[PDB]
RNA sequence: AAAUUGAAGAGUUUGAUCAUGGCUCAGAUUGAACGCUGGCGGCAGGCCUAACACAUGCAAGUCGAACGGUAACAGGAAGAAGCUUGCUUCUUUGCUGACGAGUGGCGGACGGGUGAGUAAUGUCUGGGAAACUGCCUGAUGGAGGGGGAUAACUACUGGAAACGGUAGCUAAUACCGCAUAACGUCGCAAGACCAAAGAGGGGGACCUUCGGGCCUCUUGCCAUCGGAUGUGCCCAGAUGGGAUUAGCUAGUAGGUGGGGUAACGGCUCACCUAGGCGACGAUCCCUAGCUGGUCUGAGAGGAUGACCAGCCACACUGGAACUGAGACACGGUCCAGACUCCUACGGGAGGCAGCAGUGGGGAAUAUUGCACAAUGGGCGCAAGCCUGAUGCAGCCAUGCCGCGUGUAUGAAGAAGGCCUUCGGGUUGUAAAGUACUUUCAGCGGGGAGGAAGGGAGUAAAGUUAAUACCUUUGCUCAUUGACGUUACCCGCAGAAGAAGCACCGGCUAACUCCGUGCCAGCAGCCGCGGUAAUACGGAGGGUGCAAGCGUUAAUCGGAAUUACUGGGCGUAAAGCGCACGCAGGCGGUUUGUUAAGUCAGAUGUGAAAUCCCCGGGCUCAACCUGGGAACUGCAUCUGAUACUGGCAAG
RNA sequence: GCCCGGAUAGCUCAGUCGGUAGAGCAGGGGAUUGAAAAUCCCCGUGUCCUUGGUUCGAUUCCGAGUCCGGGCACCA
């Protein structure tokens, strides 16, 4: 083979590609609030930031935005960072 | 496939009757038995260990009338079979349809019996077999088709079978045009006119 | 390669496109081939009746 | 995937004759140009009178009746061939292939040497069915001098026993019919009026066993090897089993295509040029010395007995006797072959203007039977005409 | 249903002989070709060369039972008009059948093809621990509400075309947030945090815009935990050559911290330490998909992976990324490269290593087959749709086997050929003739099975709404074959249509004549042939094989001719010129103790196919297939300790 | 289909491109031998392109064709 009689499953794929990008980068840049509050030294501001994050940190893997069992390990890693602070 | 050419040619070359072409010449004019073929036929015969092997293999294949591919096949089958290969091959040769038809006097020669088989004549177990290489089973009955009961040569052949001993693994009835293959073909009744070891010794070279 | 050509009658020329099989013939130095008669530009040998499969000459005719 | 030519009415293969400069290619454009307007219904269009590079490239004239068109009685294809002596082979075969010919002369020149050569072919190898066209008439100021220019042609006709005035000799100016002059577009289609009725009509041997003596061969990309030429006899349909005899080993194929003028063909017909695609055939193996045919109807031979007449110098034959041991070129339909000849007991020569029995020995075999015509040639002239009286082995 | 039949010799060195030793060779096999010959049938087989390039066709879609729509087609319905006049035209109407196109879901990543790369972290064999999923399935719970977008379409509009552009409208099982959450998720715990879908069938009652609502039924959805086919990771062993193939590495080795991952690790970033790897083979270069297994041979051993099948890689080339359960992907996307092609010159298109087909290469290869019949596969709620998947005819002596080409009979053998001692001898019962039959092929007629399921109708039972709907099964009769005028059967002449090819010096079975006269050539080796050649060419006769025949190559045997099986070395080719001595190999004898080696034991495993053992079936065979055995080993663990090994003592 | 070149003794080379074609190298016969080599003595080859033509005369000039090498050319 070389060809198929339709091409449309590629265009359904691009429609999906652009609709994933448009909120996968949203959920990934909120993390700057947790890292800036980690950089500010303060455990309480670090936690408030991560508390804004939990809504998006579970939801991104429940939903298709990164899919699979990626929420558990991210939620665990982010607690494991901010518990280094006091 | 069958031997189509001059049949007493073979008998003269192998120095034996082969029980084929069983007719006679008038007043024995140029009856040409007990002499070798051709213009150089007056020569006294000369041997070798390879000549004896080739001539014993020719002998058995001229007895039962079988091709070389057929005999090479039967010898592989014989060697697959348990016991000794020599007797295993001879059992194959004694059970095949055309040969059992000659044995039961339906064909006065091997070629009469193979022609009978070609012409869809024999049913065995009541089911028709038109081919030379069907192995007749123990305790089965061979039966001439009604459209084959008319061959004047077969009705004559069963008279040419009288005062000719028949293998003790079968009986036949001229009056029925039916013969019982009463029991299993028996190596303790019939053999070829050769030594079974020499004819397979040459295959190792 | 040097290649032996069997039986008399030679139709071949210094650009005739031909086939050759093995022909072992240490009698002639280096020769390990034989030129196939009645193939490509090679025709069969003259005045033959004992060969048919050999010499490219075919079965004799009326 | 391609479009289909549909076999309604008969269809016949014709061709121009005469000398160089006379109009032999101008006429074949110009006739096809006015026919597509007048018979076909069209308005004068530039792509009618000029043609594309791609058609010129394959319908090279000298192997193809490169123009195919229709008229009210038959379809016609028409061939353009050299008016010079540098190449005559495809003219002298095209004579045995055509049901008649279009004799072209330019009023400015009169007849020239190849106009005197090509007229003999309809007696010698082909058919005496010739229709005539006088080109560049518009240049001559006087009709009564045009008539004296034309009186050369009535003499030439009468030289080879064509009726000098009961032959139809149309007046025209083919370069003016081509471009779109109102008078000369109106003085070309007169020729198709005579062509539809002078033959009087073509007739096809389509009841008979199939015989295609191959003229020429092509290599179609993606589909393989096509052999083409006038079908002399019989009929074809797509998927018939076919036999090739001649200069090669006898072989069997399947005709797996059948076309004419690069269009699909419901049926290959006798008396017309047809192309055939063939199963298990390579452009490497096949030769023009082949004949495609109905299986087991004709077989190759190199040797034959025949009757042959030696021309007289009247017809442009010999004046010297024709000796034994000669090496003439023979002509059979689409194909030429050379053979060495022999004369009867104690005959060293046969005189010009006499018939003899001859035995030939060709330098390669072709498929042959009795009743098959030939001519012999020794170069500068045809020197005899004859018929195969029986084959030899 | 267990089990073997398997092991060779021959020609050739000299005057002669023994021993040594090469060479030639009989046999088997190949996806083999060549040249001659050729009738019939089964089943099997057809690039094994250029991963060299392909014209043209045809090959993954599908669902109206997710949604908006109504182009096409028919219908109904209604309107309007006419003697087309109780039948008919024109129109309208998503109203219904229905469906072009659009939106949307699931699957296209499967099958099929190719074997280029790759001596491989891939593969094979056997195990290890930190993993995961289409979809099926167990179990438990759930389904709140709202918004937003936009194609089809509408209008407007550019370009030769590809390609479209501008602005407007709006639906969902589509899109998105919120709501709301477990045995869920994270957090040591407090606590915090996360989801989602409907659709469709149908009825008594009940609302009602008569649309719809409510109900029930069925089917689908979502969340979460389990199971399961499937898949990933890791680890040991095993995996061609070159050592005239001796160094390789920090881009590593080891660690620590972070990052990243489904999970795991220099995966990856950074630091710190300096290590890691190699001559029991790092490194480097050469070759090469593997394996089950196929062939050959007593087997060992060798060759070997092909036809089929398990696994792997690849799809004109090079880079990257993505959609998603899953894919730098064959059928897809961006970009680049090369070639080729179209073009209105502005611009664009494409990759048979699917299937059939073609050119080219080469020693050498089917028909742009046929088909819904049956099987698998994808979507399909089902009817249905898809499929070059699948099945099956064609072409060809390419493979294997079976069958026939007449047979029975038949001479003063008569012609003829051949040889001759000229008597005869022989070809040869061969021919003619006589007798019989037609198998096959032919012509004509008849004609099984591959067909199960599936359609509709209908009955009873169950599900349930008292009720439909829905469903399980039964019954009625409706219906389905490409191959195909089938397999097979029956009639009917009639021997009618069916033998060629190589061989005859020896090895090697087959002899005589004639010509040739070291010539033609002749063999594989030894050799032959220089005018009384079974060695040449022809002739006849003989041998052998046969619808095949010979010949060439290739592989394996013979070979023990690299000798474990199974060798020599004073001198047949051959023992180091000598010593010393590390590496490595090897080590007396006795006591105890140990158990790595060895040995016994058990359990798990190496599928199919292949072989074996024993059947079955297609008439037999080829062919197909069942059951039973087979699988030398590996993993893990239990027992023994004579012996070799270890450790300790003497 | 078209265009170009090649047809002197086995080989080579010459020869008024019309007027018995010459020489060399090699070869054949004889002698010698069972044969060959070698030697010694005698002697031949020309498809002087096939085939048709031009002429007073073809080896040599002109057409035709066959084979062989090379060029040009097409894809129903």
């Amino acid at each position: 083979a070389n060809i198929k009689s339709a091409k449309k499953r590629a265009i359904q794929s691009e429609k999906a590609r652009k609709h994933n990008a448009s909120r996968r980068s949203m959920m990934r840049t909120f993390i700057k609030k947790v890292y800036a509050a980690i950089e500010a030294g303060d455990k309480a501001a670090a936690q408030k930031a991560f508390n804004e994050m939990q809504p998006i940190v579970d939801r991104q893997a429940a939903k298709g935005l990164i899919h699979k069992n990626k929420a558990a390990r991210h939620k665990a890693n982010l607690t494991a960072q901010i518990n280094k602070l006091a | 496939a069958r031997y189509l050419g001059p049949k007493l040619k073979l008998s003269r070359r192998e120095g034996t009757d082969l029980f084929l072409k069983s007719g006679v010449r008038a007043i024995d004019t140029k009856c040409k038995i007990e002499q070798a073929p051709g213009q150089h036929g007056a020569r006294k015969p000369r041997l070798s260990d390879y000549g004896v092997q080739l001539r014993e293999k020719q002998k058995v294949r001229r007895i039962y009338g079988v091709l070389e591919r057929q005999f090479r096949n039967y010898y592989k089958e014989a060697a697959r079979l348990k016991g000794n290969t020599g007797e295993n091959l001879l059992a194959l040769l004694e059970g095949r349809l055309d040969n059992v038809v000659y044995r039961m006097g339906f064909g006065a020669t091997r070629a009469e019996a193979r022609q009978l088989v070609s012409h869809k004549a024999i049913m065995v177990n009541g089911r028709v077999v038109n081919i030379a290489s069907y192995q007749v089973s123990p305790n089965d009955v061979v039966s001439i088709r009604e459209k084959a009961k008319k061959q004047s040569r077969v009705k004559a052949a069963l008279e040419l079978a009288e005062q000719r001993e028949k293998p003790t693994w079968l009986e036949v009835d001229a009056g029925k045009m039916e013969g019982t293959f009463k029991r299993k073909p028996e190596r303790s009744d019939l053999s070829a006119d050769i030594n079974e070891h020499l004819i397979v010794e040459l295959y190792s070279k | 390669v040097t290649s032996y050509i069997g039986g008399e009658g030679h139709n071949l020329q210094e650009h005739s496109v031909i086939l050759i099989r093995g022909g072992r013939v240490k009698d002639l130095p280096g020769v390990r081939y034989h030129t196939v008669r009645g193939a490509l530009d090679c025709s069969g040998v003259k005045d033959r009746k004992q060969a048919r499969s050999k010499y490219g000459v075919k079965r004799p005719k009326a | 995937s391609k479009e289909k030519f549909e076999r309604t009415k008969p269809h016949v293969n014709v061709g121009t004759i005469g000398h160089v400069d006379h109009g032999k290619t101008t006429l074949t454009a110009a006739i096809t140009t006015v026919l597509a307007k007048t018979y076909g219904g069209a308005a004068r269009a530039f792509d009618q009178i000029d043609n594309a590079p791609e058609e010129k490239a394959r319908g090279i004239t000298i192997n193809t009746s490169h123009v195919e068109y229709d008229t009210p009685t038959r379809h016609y294809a028409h061939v353009d061939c050299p008016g010079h002596a540098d190449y005559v082979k495809n003219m002298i075969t095209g004579a045995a292939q055509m049901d008649g010919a279009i004799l072209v002369v330019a009023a400015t020149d009169g007849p020239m040497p190849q106009t005197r050569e090509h007229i003999l072919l309809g007696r010698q190898v082909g058919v005496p069915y010739i229709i005539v066209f006088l080109n560049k008439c518009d240049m001559v100021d006087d009709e009564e001098l045009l008539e004296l220019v034309e009186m050369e042609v009535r003499e030439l006709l009468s030289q080879y026993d064509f009726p000098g005035d009961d032959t139809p000799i149309v007046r025209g100016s083919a370069l003016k019919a081509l471009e779109g002059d109102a008078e000369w577009e109106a003085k070309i289609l007169e020729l198709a009026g005579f062509l539809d009725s002078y033959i009087p009509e073509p007739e096809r041997a389509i009841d008979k066993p199939f015989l295609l003596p191959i003229e020429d061969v092509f290599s179609i990309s993606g589909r393989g090897t096509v052999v083409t030429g006038r079908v002399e006899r019989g009929i074809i349909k797509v998927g018939e089993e076919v036999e090739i005899v001649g200069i090669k080993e006898t072989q069997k194929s399947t005709c797996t295509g059948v076309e004419m003028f690069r269009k699909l063909l419901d049926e290959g017909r006798a008396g017309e040029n047809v192309g055939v695609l063939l199963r298990g055939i390579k452009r490497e193996e096949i030769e023009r010395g082949q004949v495609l045919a109905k299986p087991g109807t004709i077989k190759p031979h190199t040797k034959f007995e025949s009757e042959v007449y030696i021309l007289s110098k009247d017809e442009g034959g010999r004046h010297t006797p024709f000796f034994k041991g000669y090496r003439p070129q023979f002509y059979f339909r689409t194909t030429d072959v050379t053979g060495t000849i022999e004369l009867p007991e104690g005959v060293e020569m046969v005189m010009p203007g006499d018939n003899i029995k001859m035995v030939v020995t060709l330098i390669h075999p072709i498929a042959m039977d009795d009743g098959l015509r030939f001519a012999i040639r020794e170069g500068g002239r045809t020197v005899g005409a004859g018929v195969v009286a029986k084959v030899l082995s």
Side-chain angles (χ1 to χ4, degrees):
Chain A
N2 49 298
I3 55 178
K4 182 163 282 177
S5 289
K7 287 284 188 175
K8 304 179 182 178
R9 60 79 161 183
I11 313 305
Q12 293 300 104
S13 153
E14 184 55 64
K15 286 164 64 169
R17 194 175 183 162
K18 295 234 63 63
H19 200 68
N20 181 28
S22 187
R23 295 184 306 294
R24 181 170 61 93
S25 180
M26 181 160 192
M27 292 199 183
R28 278 185 298 162
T29 53
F30 281 113
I31 211 171
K32 296 169 187 288
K33 187 198 174 187
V34 198
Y35 298 139
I38 287 162
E39 282 156 34
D42 176 42
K43 173 64 175 284
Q47 178 52 49
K48 289 185 294 287
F50 178 60
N51 187 262
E52 163 286 310
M53 209 76 191
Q54 293 174 258
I56 59 176
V57 99
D58 296 272
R59 176 180 289 141
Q60 65 186 7
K63 306 182 183 174
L65 292 170
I66 61 171
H67 74 82
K68 215 182 176 180
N69 60 292
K70 303 182 192 187
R73 63 93 186 257
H74 284 150
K75 195 173 183 181
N77 184 29
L78 286 165
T79 49
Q81 295 321 282
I82 63 183
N83 298 347
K84 301 174 181 293
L85 302 174
Chain B
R2 195 182 305 159
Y3 185 67
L4 311 185
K7 298 183 178 70
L8 304 185
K9 198 50 45 168
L10 303 179
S11 295
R12 269 49 282 167
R13 180 54 60 151
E14 297 302 279
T16 56
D17 172 59
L18 311 170
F19 56 79
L20 46 58
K21 188 57 190 71
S22 63
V24 73
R25 313 286 69 82
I27 70 174
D28 294 278
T29 304
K30 312 182 199 297
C31 188
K32 281 167 172 169
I33 59 173
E34 310 313 287
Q35 64 81 257
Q39 64 184 87
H40 48 259
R43 76 185 298 284
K44 190 178 182 177
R46 302 292 79 166
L47 299 181
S48 55
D49 187 73
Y50 170 103
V52 298
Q53 286 173 339
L54 178 149
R55 292 292 176 183
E56 284 172 84
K57 286 167 68 68
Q58 286 287 3
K59 185 160 288 182
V60 63
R61 287 175 56 255
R62 288 169 181 186
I63 287 167
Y64 285 96
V66 300
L67 202 66
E68 187 55 76
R69 176 187 68 134
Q70 285 181 336
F71 185 79
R72 180 57 166 160
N73 291 358
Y74 306 145
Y75 163 66
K76 294 164 182 178
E77 292 161 56
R80 233 276 67 78
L81 286 162
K82 298 176 177 60
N84 192 1
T85 191
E87 305 179 86
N88 302 338
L89 204 176
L90 286 160
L92 301 168
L93 289 173
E94 284 165 51
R96 71 182 306 244
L97 184 66
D98 68 330
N99 176 251
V100 173
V101 168
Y102 157 79
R103 295 290 163 69
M104 286 180 164
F106 294 120
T109 69
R110 290 293 291 97
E112 201 187 320
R114 199 171 187 143
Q115 187 68 97
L116 189 56
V117 163
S118 174
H119 293 317
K120 192 167 179 181
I122 327 299
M123 49 285 302
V124 181
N125 66 260
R127 175 269 289 103
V128 75
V129 278
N130 72 304
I131 65 302
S133 71
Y134 171 86
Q135 292 298 320
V136 183
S137 295
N139 309 81
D140 286 35
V141 181
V142 326
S143 299
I144 306 302
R145 185 183 66 158
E146 307 315 288
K147 183 175 178 178
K149 288 191 187 183
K150 58 171 183 174
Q151 280 188 26
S152 303
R153 51 187 169 114
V154 170
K155 288 174 285 182
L158 287 160
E159 319 316 299
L160 295 172
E162 302 310 288
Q163 301 72 55
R164 178 171 65 89
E165 184 59 62
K166 294 184 178 178
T168 66
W169 66 72
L170 53 73
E171 287 167 288
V172 58
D173 195 307
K176 295 179 186 177
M177 303 187 76
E178 186 186 83
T180 65
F181 192 93
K182 74 198 175 187
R183 71 178 187 82
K184 79 299 299 184
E186 184 58 74
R187 290 290 290 105
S188 304
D189 171 72
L190 201 147
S191 47
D193 197 39
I194 51 55
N195 183 6
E196 57 169 44
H197 300 338
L198 297 177
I199 57 164
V200 303
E201 188 175 306
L202 178 57
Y203 288 129
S204 305
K205 303 187 187 174
Chain C
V1 297
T2 300
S3 187
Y4 186 22
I5 193 162
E8 187 64 279
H10 297 286
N11 67 98
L12 297 183
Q13 177 270 330
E14 302 191 285
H15 296 97
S16 289
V17 191
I18 54 169
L19 305 180
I20 91 291
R21 65 173 70 258
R24 284 59 44 62
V25 61
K26 63 163 54 176
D27 196 7
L28 301 180
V31 182
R32 292 183 292 259
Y33 310 88
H34 205 87
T35 302
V36 180
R37 303 295 302 189
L40 303 180
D41 292 87
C42 200
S43 73
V45 177
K46 266 295 307 181
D47 305 296
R48 292 298 185 263
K49 303 90 198 180
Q50 305 189 1
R52 297 87 72 171
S53 294
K54 305 179 305 301
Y55 293 149
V57 301
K58 326 200 65 174
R59 189 175 56 184
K61 305 301 185 189
Chain D
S1 56
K2 195 157 65 179
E3 285 64 69
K4 179 183 174 293
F5 190 87
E6 189 283 297
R7 288 293 208 196
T8 187
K9 309 195 310 297
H11 190 353
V12 69
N13 46 14
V14 296
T16 56
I17 59 174
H19 198 79
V20 60
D21 316 286
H22 288 191
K24 292 184 67 176
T25 192
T26 303
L27 190 60
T28 60
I31 193 62
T32 304
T33 273
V34 173
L35 283 174
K37 294 168 57 276
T38 61
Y39 182 71
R44 189 168 290 276
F46 172 71
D47 301 284
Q48 196 183 75
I49 74 174
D50 182 71
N51 73 106
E54 297 181 90
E55 194 294 303
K56 303 178 181 173
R58 61 179 167 69
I60 59 171
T61 84
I62 58 68
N63 68 355
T64 299
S65 297
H66 60 99
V67 280
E68 191 281 304
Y69 52 90
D70 195 28
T71 76
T73 63
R74 283 88 66 180
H75 291 69
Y76 291 84
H78 195 11
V79 77
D80 167 61
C81 291
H84 193 220
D86 184 272
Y87 173 19
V88 297
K89 187 168 288 183
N90 69 321
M91 193 73 264
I92 66 180
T93 57
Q97 262 63 87
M98 73 211 314
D99 287 67
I102 305 307
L103 174 61
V104 193
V105 179
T108 59
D109 298 320
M112 261 197 281
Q114 275 67 83
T115 317
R116 304 184 182 93
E117 180 193 304
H118 298 9
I119 183 163
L120 178 62
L121 306 176
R123 307 300 171 177
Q124 187 62 12
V125 285
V127 296
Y129 281 113
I130 62 176
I131 299 87
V132 187
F133 182 85
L134 186 60
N135 191 5
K136 311 182 189 177
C137 290
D138 180 74
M139 303 184 186
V140 186
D141 300 290
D142 176 43
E143 296 303 283
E144 181 285 319
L145 177 61
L146 194 58
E147 168 281 300
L148 294 172
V149 165
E150 190 174 302
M151 186 168 277
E152 303 179 88
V153 185
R154 312 182 188 121
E155 265 70 288
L156 182 53
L157 290 169
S158 73
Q159 188 180 356
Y160 302 100
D161 311 285
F162 302 84
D165 290 89
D166 316 287
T167 290
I169 303 170
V170 173
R171 287 181 173 181
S173 187
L175 298 160
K176 304 185 67 65
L178 187 58
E179 74 191 81
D181 192 283
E183 185 55 67
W184 301 105
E185 80 189 70
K187 289 181 64 178
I188 192 162
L189 75 180
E190 306 177 288
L191 194 68
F194 291 113
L195 185 59
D196 284 29
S197 65
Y198 190 84
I199 303 178
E201 189 166 75
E203 293 186 271
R204 321 287 56 170
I206 201 171
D207 69 282
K208 296 296 190 297
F210 171 56
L211 190 66
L212 169 53
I214 299 161
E215 180 62 85
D216 65 283
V217 301
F218 296 117
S219 187
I220 316 304
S221 298
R223 285 271 64 191
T225 305
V226 168
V227 305
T228 187
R230 183 170 172 175
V231 180
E232 295 301 323
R233 301 191 304 143
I235 189 173
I236 335 174
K237 295 291 190 169
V238 187
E240 290 179 8
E241 301 307 297
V242 291
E243 178 184 272
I244 208 180
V245 284
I247 193 172
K248 307 199 307 168
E249 181 59 71
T250 307
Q251 298 171 3
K252 185 187 88 288
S253 295
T254 308
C255 63
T256 52
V258 184
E259 296 192 15
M260 181 285 297
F261 196 55
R262 300 76 172 162
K263 293 168 290 188
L264 307 179
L265 199 70
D266 55 273
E267 187 183 300
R269 302 194 174 200
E272 185 57 14
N273 187 358
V274 179
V276 180
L277 176 64
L278 291 176
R279 170 272 296 210
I281 299 298
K282 293 290 297 193
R283 190 66 158 68
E284 295 89 84
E285 49 168 288
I286 42 55
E287 296 178 86
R288 172 177 174 269
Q290 291 290 86
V291 177
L292 197 73
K294 200 76 70 188
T297 62
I298 191 170
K299 298 298 174 184
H301 298 281
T302 197
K303 196 188 178 66
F304 65 94
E305 190 165 89
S306 57
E307 304 307 313
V308 65
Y309 179 75
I310 310 304
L311 294 176
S312 61
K313 70 197 67 63
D314 181 76
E315 292 296 282
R318 307 177 63 71
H319 63 94
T320 51
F322 182 89
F323 299 81
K324 192 173 180 175
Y326 221 117
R327 61 190 293 117
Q329 182 71 268
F330 296 80
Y331 287 88
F332 289 98
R333 307 302 173 278
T334 62
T335 60
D336 66 271
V337 62
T338 285
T340 56
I341 68 83
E342 299 92 68
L343 303 180
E345 303 308 286
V347 184
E348 183 50 51
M349 339 75 175
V350 51
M351 280 59 191
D354 185 67
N355 187 271
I356 198 58
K357 187 169 76 176
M358 169 178 66
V359 176
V360 183
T361 305
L362 303 178
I363 67 94
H364 74 72
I366 57 167
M368 187 172 288
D369 268 295
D370 65 271
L372 179 64
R373 182 183 180 183
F374 54 87
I376 50 169
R377 202 198 73 151
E378 53 68 86
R381 54 164 183 271
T382 52
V383 289
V387 67
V388 177
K390 56 180 175 66
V391 293
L392 298 172
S393 294

